[PDB]
Amino acid sequence: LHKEPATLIKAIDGDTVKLMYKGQPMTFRLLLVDTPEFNEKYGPEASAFTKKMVENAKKIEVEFDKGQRTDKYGRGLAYSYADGKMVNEALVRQGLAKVAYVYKGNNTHEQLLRKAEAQAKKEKLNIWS
């Protein structure tokens, strides 16, 4: 897998963000995670967490996995990094997302994320509290 550049256009919610990628605006949906919707418990906290992470970053990157790069809604499917830190993993590690939507061929970072979820759950963090 390869990191590629992108620039923040707008935070949207915990697991979706609007980025400029190859010069085009796209909504990205973060691979392998599920945040609560804004309307649901921890939803605002997930949204706040991702927002700060992407807004505070000097450098945003996206990393596609080996399989589909866009979903049925035309959202980009990627791992995203804020100054070298994976947003996907960080959400899970904080108990603000569950590992989810694990599809064959787009799951390179599955076990990394499951390990973070296990640590979050052990800490009884947020969603696991």
Ligand SMILES: Cc1cn([C@H]2C[C@H](OP(=O)(O)O)[C@@H](COP(=O)(O)O)O2)c(=O)[nH]c1=O
């Ligand atoms: C994360 C992810 C979601 N999706 C689709 C599956 C779900 O379809 P449905 O909308 O039919 O439920 C939806 C979940 O996204 P959200 O959690 O953003 O709603 O997005 C993918 O197809 N691939 C993916 O890797």
Ligand SMILES: [Ca+2]
């Ligand atoms: Ca969601």
